[PDB]
């Protein structure tokens, strides 16, 4: 039998096939099985609180009307223009902010049917998905980004999604992210939805992203460390050199404030304290304290007499030990905690 | 008893053999079609002060009766239909009057739902992304509360042909656990009419208002506390020796200059409005205090030119008063500022 | 008569109506009357030199083929899908850079026909229109932004646009702009076009936008004023304090240069002098002059003798009066002029 | 003859006209004549190396199948929906990065046919075209931006483009650009293309854009001039005031480095030296030299003896003359060269 | 009388042909052999942040379809109107590493279709592609990157369809094409990237471009300015040890400028967590400048007691520093440039 006639008798003019009717429509819900191949994963944005993926979405289900005996072949690969002629599930991504198909150089779609009427339907998609982030531990934070696959129009009595048993989420070999490690373990869950329109099938995959620390050492932690150390050289400068020691205090304090606002510049304007904020605040305190230390030195030594010059000199000699020591102690606590 | 095939049924109801004309409204010689609306807010964000707008992802639900779609061929109270049948039925021409951008969702198929009932009722739900305009009053920024609206209007049907109404029970649902980084979305939403009168006629319009309360925390960290520290910095001058002119002048210069950049930085993310905001008052007063500290030293340096006891003492008195009065005056200002805006 | 049959006989299968033929095609030009409702008005950008509007565009004209007697109704409101079946004008916006229709939740279009064959056609549009700006007086400038409505394909012998007599341009109640005042008076005129393809109807509306001053006082004028005043404290500082008075000069001069570049950061890179440039330049001069004043004080007082110390002290006492006085005089002239 | 019947017999159902066949398909190549009206010209971006135009593209050619005798009219203006029914050239813009039609409120297209079968086809387009820039003389540079009109699918034996003889490129009256002068003279030439698929007709227009100098005087040259002059006040300050004269050196050097990076901020990251780079480098040298001059003054005068104080004082008195003199000489050379 | 084109197209691929575009050439036989070549019309927007690049190309595909063989004309080939592309079978080539892609439709579809006597087809189409290019920035900005383009079948397995680069000049580049930041090397690697998914085995061919980053911009913007800050720090060693505020100001400002210089060197880059070549340079420059300030702390400290022996010890620290800092910095430079501009 010629393919033209076969497609005509199976799903075309002479078939009686109505794509507006689901498989087993008077019977139990259609069981759809899903798997995804992650071709690309990136544009993880803290500001807009979202991420981007390029995937192949695979859907599998049985349609008795598409069973065939005219060929011995276990399966038939069909031209994707035939997708418009068959019923298919109405899967959408519930947490999608943007989504598009791929049509270059032709529709990036695949359709395969089997002897028994099983269907395999694969389609390439780009998705911008929302990922609400908890930044309390930033930048030592780990985020969980989800992808929800839901039916828009079919209730659970007509249609049900399920992840495939074997390897439901594959990731392209050698895929890396500059800022994060994508963990190998992905959680699969149900997100069954209850709206005023009914109860809708929904399955979910959760990705765990661990933020890499290196960039923040170079950009943020080490530079701020050096500003703190800079403030300490004041303690070895002559107490008579007021403009020198005051310049050291001013510039370290001011640099520390811009350092602090710069540490948030790439983040959404959240109203809770983050781990980087604690660090910048304490660094700012230490640097401000060094200036206050000189104010005290300059003040107690006003009357240029031995007893008061000695009291001022003692403040300096203690500060040379205590500031670095207290800062080391804070460091122990900070790093151990996070 | 062989029930009628769906194909034949859809043919007889709204297809080739039905005589149904989607260009004609239900009860077209009779009273206006009563449409009932509800929305599910799936997502709510991109609240931008600069462009003065916000973004929502919603399911829009419309309900109305169409006698032509009543059926007796099945016992089922309702039928869920393939959304391709939406092109074959009449439906309202609802648009969003304050929408700047709007799109449907077509991945992996049209995000639309169509359900009809025995008596001819229709339920029509569609997923939409909308950028809606929200004119903001920033006088109290960043202790401001904004009201953002969404207007649902008929474009082509006058009130004698079509009427929108919010559903009685829970017209606006919000997805569980939905939060916004910068705002609190209040539980209470106002519903009202925005009936429109143009030179083309009178048009049905209903409105929902959301109340958004700006969260304070970010502004304490980014703006208020840093500026506070610059003011405190300026005060250390008063404990520095009056002989150290370059030290005390450096303190004055740098605090004044930092305060000016601090001030322009407090507006960088905002539209260029011509009224005074609450953050402006704060930055201006902080700038005044820091400038005053420098002027205080100018006075100290000037009155003590002649190095004589009486004039050195007068300069020293200016410093000892300043150590008490600047922090005291700044505390008083703080009391007034916070009490006025946050109480 | 059923509406279906009526639409069939008027403009459908049995009508003989050809939408490719204009009303009175062998006769005089079609007279189209236009009015707009401005639903929204904003995104006024100096850099890209344009603005954005959301409007309802209303077009009115007579088509004898659409006259009816089958109903007593003065007018009929028709489903907008019938717009594809009737002739309509080919109005475009000549100074449009971007334009879109609105299709959510259905086409934002309105079609009404009258007994005598008049048509009312309204459509919702978003337009980005070009507005060439003259910034000589910025930020005390007033701009004129235009909207041109033109026929693309019909010459004046076939088609003519005209503004409606009564209230051709309506503006939504309570519409405001953050940076501008939109004046109540709008100029209407003709912009008849002559190309090498012929002569084309074109009507124009002009909006007057007056820039609000407040933002620039807060952001630009007052901050620069304070830098000038800052420079003057130098005159009350001891002439022996060289690093103090030189620091005052350096920092005010440098801040004034960044202040100056910052005043243009949001503007197109025009090559003429603006009002804000004059101000920043004079402020820069005053602040530079204060530093030069100290150079003179430091220089004439090198030899630490009474006669030369007195000459340096006289320079300071004059400067305390003359700088503020000269700056006040400049202010009088500047504000009075603009 | 009714227009409906005429269009039917000319290019519709009863015509036998096949738009997939070119005019004179067994004969010589179709001669197409082109002219453009430039409605708008802007968004000249150095970073992305491109520019934007809004144009009316006019194409003219002869199609014997469209000749008519049924009307005395020299030409007929046809509804643009008839464009889908006729053959037309497949002109594309070879250096186009983005391009769109205009469809508000209807298709911005014009179709006119003449007794002898000539066709005039005009269409409105927005184009982003690539313009590779040579920035060696920036910002005293002149750029040449081109527009190439090419056939995609017809070789030279089937289709040939040619600019119109009379006024092939018209520009809207009063069109200006903020940063550039568009010269009146436009070069026309051939860009005939040879690919492995054959030989393709291609015509080119070249626009000459002269960058306006004013913005760069205000933003870049004059501010940097003032920093150089600032550095010179050091020479009149007391050699005993080390922190004052060193502060002058530091701040002018540092301001000059940010001034230098700021002069490139709006430009692509090219690896050759530009005219603004030469200027900033020399300004940086002069300002650095002034600081080195003080290092010498401070160093030679360490031993506080008359002979060495005098030597240091001589260095200052020479510097007061030579720095301004050498800087004037450099200015002469710089401006004269460019 | 030769057959009219209308009738010919009708008999070849239209109404009377029996041609079904849903069936591949030789469908019961071996795989269709498709041959590909590209013309690169434009190549740019190489972004480190988004880790991608943009090309404008003509994609050429060649294959044989026996159903399209003709004898009705003596012409070796026929150039057909591209609307006929919808009527013929064609491969389903997609770009596997494409993030964005569009056709070109102004002023008509930028497509070409040519068929030959023996049924060969030539199909060319103009495309704009944003392709992903993962970058290794360890040696930035003396880095060389490899950007790839993968051409794959989406729906046909290797038993039905196979892609192959053309033998003669598979990748042509427009004459005079240059990139501001890079040199595109003349040699392009051609490779197979055959894909094995859970859906089967799919043909995939690959071209690799080598891009060498040009150094000049980084000398002007980054290396030389940082060099001058280091030299600035050295003038301190020739300034009087009594001038504490002068020498401390030199130390502060060079250190602070060096930190902003360092963050500015990464501002245009993705936030990678490894050390780059520019980072090493900025870090060492920062060390040198910090060391100069520490040198003065030592000078100021050892000379506290104003006695000849301790003033002399402080003076010796300065005279050594005048030689050793420039010498040590020269040595570092030798090592740095030799390492990166060789290995
Ligand atoms: C067969 C369809 C649908 C329909 O159109 N009709 C006429 C009937 C008739 C009798 N009983 C049920 C129906 C409905 C339900 N079925 S369906 O399960 O195949 C179906 C089809 C399409 C749907 C849908 C359900 O919900 C979402 O869109
Ligand atoms: C039936 C429609 C419309 C129409 O086409 N005709 C012929 C008539 C005939 C008699 N009376 C009214 C009409 C109009 C109005 N009706 S309608 O109420 O169903 C209708 C239909 C579509 C509409 C509309 C109103 O407002 C704008 O879009
Ligand atoms: C009737 C049309 C147009 C046409 O197609 N034909 C055949 C004739 C025949 C005789 N005389 C004139 C025509 C032209 C003019 N008319 S029209 O005035 O209705 C018309 C119709 C459409 C047009 C147009 C003018 O310019 C822009 O596009
Ligand atoms: C007549 C057309 C085209 C065609 O379809 N056929 C069947 C034949 C038959 C005999 N000789 C030539 C052809 C080709 C060429 N001509 S055409 O010159 O009008 C033509 C038409 C369309 C074209 C084209 C050339 O190149 C680009 O797209
Ligand atoms: C002939 C087609 C396709 C088809 O529709 N049917 C009915 C049959 C029948 C018997 N054997 C195979 C088929 C399949 C495969 N062939 S095909 O090789 O031309 C083909 C056609 C289209 C394809 C495809 C393969 O893979 C992706 O899309
Ligand atoms: Cl300073
Ligand atoms: Zn897990
Ligand atoms: Zn309320
Ligand atoms: Zn006016
Ligand atoms: Zn020329
Ligand atoms: Zn290679």
CA distance D95 to B263: 46
Quote the distance between the C-alpha of residue D115 and its chain's center: 42
Closest CA to C233 of C310, C318, C329, C320: C320
Q: Across the strands, what pairs with B54?
A: B132
Which residue in chain D has the smallest CA separation from C84? D106
Write down the residue that tokens 């940076």 correspond to: C179
Closest CA to B208 of B158, B166, B179: B166
CA of B61 relative to ligand 1 center, distance in Å: 19
Q: Are B181 and B212 in contact (CB under 8 A)?
A: no
Q: Residue A292 CB: number of other CB atoms within 10 A?
A: 14
Q: Are D87 and C168 in contact (CB under 8 A)?
A: no
Q: Does E74 touch chain D (CB under 8 A)?
A: no
Write down the residue that tokens 């040009």 correspond to: E214
Identify which of D97, D127, D277 has the shortest CB distance to residue E220.
D277
Q: Are C201 and C159 in contact (CB under 8 A)?
A: yes
What's the token pair of residue B339? Answer: 């009490």
Distances from the Cα of D337 to the Cαs of A73, C27, C142, D332, in angstroms? 80, 67, 41, 8
Tell me: do A66 and A152 sit in the same domain: yes
Q: Are B107 and A100 in contact (CB under 8 A)?
A: yes
Closest CA to A202 of A212, A210, A213, A194: A194
What's the token pair of residue E52? Answer: 């991608």
Tell me: do E146 and E59 sit in the same domain: yes
Burial string for D299-334 (b: 16+ CB within 10 Å, else e) reads ebbeeeeeeeeeebeebbeebeeebeeebeebeeee
Annotated binding site of A for Zn(2+): 185, 187, 208
Query: Considering every ligand atom, which ligand is closest to the CA of A122?
Result: 5
Residues 76-115 of C with CB under 8 A from D: 88-97, 99-101
Q: Are B101 and B133 in contact (CB under 8 A)?
A: no
Q: Whose CA is nearest to atom 15 of ligand 5?
A: A77
Tell me: do C150 and C291 sit in the same domain: no
What's the token pair of residue C30? Answer: 């079609």
Q: Are A239 and A301 in contact (CB under 8 A)?
A: yes
Q: Are C174 and C123 in contact (CB under 8 A)?
A: no
Among residues D195, D212, D229, the one where a domain terminates is D212
Strand A50-62 relative to strand A118-130, pairing = antiparallel
- Cβ partners under 8 Å of residue B97, min gap 6: B151, B152, B153, B194, B196, B205, C39
CA distance D25 to D233: 81
Tell me: do E114 and E138 sit in the same domain: yes
Write down the residue that tokens 């978003």 correspond to: C126
Q: Are B327 and B235 in contact (CB under 8 A)?
A: yes
Q: Which stretches within chain B are classed as H helix?
A: 6-14, 217-219, 225-236, 245-265, 278-303, 309-341
Q: Residue D6 CB: number of other CB atoms within 10 A?
A: 15
Among residues B189, B215, B241, the one where a domain terminates is B215
Write down the residue that tokens 């006019």 correspond to: D58
Experimental method: X-ray
Q: Are D29 and D7 in contact (CB under 8 A)?
A: no
| Cis amide leading into E141 (omega within 30) | yes
Q: Are E63 and E91 in contact (CB under 8 A)?
A: yes
Q: Across the strands, what pairs with B65?
A: B121
Burial string for B319-337 (b: 16+ CB within 10 Å, else e) reads beebeeebeeebeebeeee
Tell me: do A88 and A160 sit in the same domain: yes
CA distance D276 to E231: 23
Element (H, E) at D133: none
Indicate the number of domains in chain E.
2
Tell me: do D111 and D177 sit in the same domain: yes
Closest CA to C87 of C8, C14, C24: C24
Provide the 3-class DSSP secondary structure of residue C22.
coil
**C-beta of A73 in contact with ligand 5 (< 6 A):** yes
Provide the 3-class DSSP secondary structure of residue D79.
coil
Tell me: do C91 and C135 sit in the same domain: yes
Provide the 3-class DSSP secondary structure of residue D174.
coil
| Domain CATH number, residue C123 | 2.70.170.10
Q: C227–B276: do the CB atoms touch at under 8 Å? A: no
Residues 244-263 of D with CB under 8 A from C: 244, 247-248, 251, 255, 262
Distances from the Cα of C207 to the Cαs of B274, C41, C53, E113, in angstroms? 21, 11, 12, 51
Tell me: do A205 and A245 sit in the same domain: no
Tell me: do B174 and B235 sit in the same domain: no
Quote the distance between the C-alpha of residue E116 and its chain's center: 38
| Domain CATH number, residue D294 | 1.20.58.390
CA of D8 relative to ligand 4 center, distance in Å: 24
Strand B121-133 relative to strand B112-117, pairing = antiparallel
For D35, phi then psi, to 5°, come to -145, 155
Q: E107–D100: do the CB atoms touch at under 8 Å? A: no
Name chain E contacts of D25, Cβ cutoff 8 Å: 5
Q: Is C195 annotated as a binding residue?
A: yes
Q: Which stretches within chain D are classed as H helix?
A: 3-11, 214-216, 222-233, 242-262, 275-300, 306-337
Tell me: do D26 and D51 sit in the same domain: yes
Identify which of E20, E59, E125 has the shortest CB distance to residue A4.
E20
Provide the 3-class DSSP secondary structure of residue A128.
strand
Provide the 3-class DSSP secondary structure of residue E91.
coil
What's the token pair of residue E302? Answer: 């050892």
Q: Are E83 and D99 in contact (CB under 8 A)?
A: no
Q: Does E268 touch chain A (CB under 8 A)?
A: no
For C263, phi then psi, to 5°, come to -70, -15
Closest CA to E270 of D12, A214, A72: A214
Burial string for B282-306 (b: 16+ CB within 10 Å, else e) reads bbebbbebbbebbebbbbbbebbee
For C272, phi then psi, to 5°, come to -105, 160
The burial class, CB within 10 Å (0-12 / 13-18 / 19+), for D11 is: buried
Domain boundaries, position A242 = 213-338
- Cβ partners under 8 Å of residue B123, min gap 6: A197, B61, B62, B63, B78, B113, B114, B115, B116, B117
CA of A279 relative to ligand 8 center, distance in Å: 41
Q: Is B337 annotated as a binding residue?
A: no
Q: Does E225 touch chain D (CB under 8 A)?
A: yes
- Cβ partners under 8 Å of residue D285, min gap 6: none
C-alpha radius of gyration, chain A, whole number: 32
Tell me: do C169 and C89 sit in the same domain: yes
CA distance E339 to E281: 12
What's the token pair of residue D62? Answer: 């002869």
CA distance D147 to D191: 10
Identify which of C20, C253, C268 has the shortest CB distance to residue D230.
C253
Q: Across the strands, what pairs with A36?
A: A57, A169
Which residue in chain E has the smallest CA separation from D48? E45
- Cβ partners under 8 Å of residue D292, min gap 6: E235
Q: Across the strands, what pairs with B56?
A: B44, B130
Identify which of A35, A213, A237 has the shortest CB distance to residue E273.
A213
Tell me: do C104 and C170 sit in the same domain: yes
CA distance D86 to D22: 9
**C-beta of C198 in contact with ligand 3 (< 6 A):** no
What's the token pair of residue D153? Answer: 């699918």
Q: Across the strands, what pairs with D191?
A: none
Q: Are A224 and A280 in contact (CB under 8 A)?
A: yes
| Cis amide leading into A101 (omega within 30) | no
State the greatest distance between any 2 C-alpha atoms of chain D, in Å, as a whole number: 115
Name chain D contacts of C273, Cβ cutoff 8 Å: 214, 218
Dihedral Cα C247, C253, C255, C256, nearest 10 deg: 160
CA distance C25 to C18: 12
Q: Are E153 and E90 in contact (CB under 8 A)?
A: no
CA distance B79 to B81: 6
DSSP summary character for residue A104: S
CA distance D171 to B29: 56
CA of C182 relative to ligand 9 center, distance in Å: 11
**C-beta of D90 in contact with ligand 3 (< 6 A):** no
Q: Are B115 and B80 in contact (CB under 8 A)?
A: yes
Chains that touch D (3 or more CB pairs under 8 A): C, E
CA distance B153 to B195: 8
CA distance A213 to A247: 33
What's the token pair of residue C129? Answer: 């229109």
Q: D92–E108: do the CB atoms touch at under 8 Å? A: yes
Interface test mutation site (partner A, options B7, B42, B44, B80, max chain A beta carbons within 10 A): B80
The burial class, CB within 10 Å (0-12 / 13-18 / 19+), for E29 is: exposed
Identify which of A4, A108, A126 has the shortest CB distance to residue E94.
A108
DSSP summary character for residue A316: H
Q: Whose CA is nearest to atom 3 of ligand 1?
A: B81
Among residues D212, D233, D258, the one where a domain terminates is D212
């Amino acid at each position: 039998m010629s393919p033209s006639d076969f497609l005509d008798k199976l799903m075309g003019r002479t078939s009686g096939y109505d794509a507006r009717i689901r498989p087993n429509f008077k019977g139990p819900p259609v069981q759809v099985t899903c798997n995804i191949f992650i071709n690309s994963f990136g544009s993880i944005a803290e500001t807009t609180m979202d991420y981007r993926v390029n995937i192949f979405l695979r859907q599998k289900w049985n349609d008795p009307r598409l069973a065939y005996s005219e060929y011995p072949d276990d399966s038939l690969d069909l031209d994707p223009s035939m997708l418009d002629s068959i019923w298919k599930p109405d899967l959408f991504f519930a947490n999608e902010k943007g989504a598009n198909f791929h049509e270059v150089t032709t529709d990036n779609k695949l359709l395969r049917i089997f002897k028994n009427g099983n269907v395999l339907y694969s389609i390439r998609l780009t998705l911008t998905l929302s990922c609400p982030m908890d930044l309390k531990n930033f930048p030592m934070d780990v985020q969980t980004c989800i992808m929800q696959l839901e039916s828009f129009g079919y209730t659970m009595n007509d249609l049900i999604f399920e992840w495939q048993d074997e390897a439901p989420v594959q990731v392209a070999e050698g895929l890396t992210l500059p800022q994060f490690l994508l963990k190998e373990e992905k959680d699969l869950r149900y997100c069954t939805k209850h709206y005023n329109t009914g109860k809708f099938t929904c399955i979910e995959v959760r990705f765990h992203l661990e933020r890499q620390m290196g960039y923040y050492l170079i950009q943020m932690y080490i530079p701020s460390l050096l500003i703190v150390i800079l403030s300490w050289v004041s303690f070895w400068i002559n107490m008579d050199a007021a403009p020198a020691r005051v310049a050291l205090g001013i510039t370290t304090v001011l640099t520390m404030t811009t350092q602090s606002s710069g540490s948030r510049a790439s983040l959404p304007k959240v109203s809770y304290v983050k781990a980087i904020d604690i660090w910048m605040a304490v660094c700012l305190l230490f640097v401000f304290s060094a200036l206050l230390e000189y104010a005290a030195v300059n003040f107690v030594s006003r009357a240029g007499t031995k007893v008061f010059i000695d009291r001022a000199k003692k403040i300096d000699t203690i500060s040379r030990a205590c500031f670095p020591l207290a800062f080391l102690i804070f460091n122990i606590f900070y790093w151990v905690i996070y």
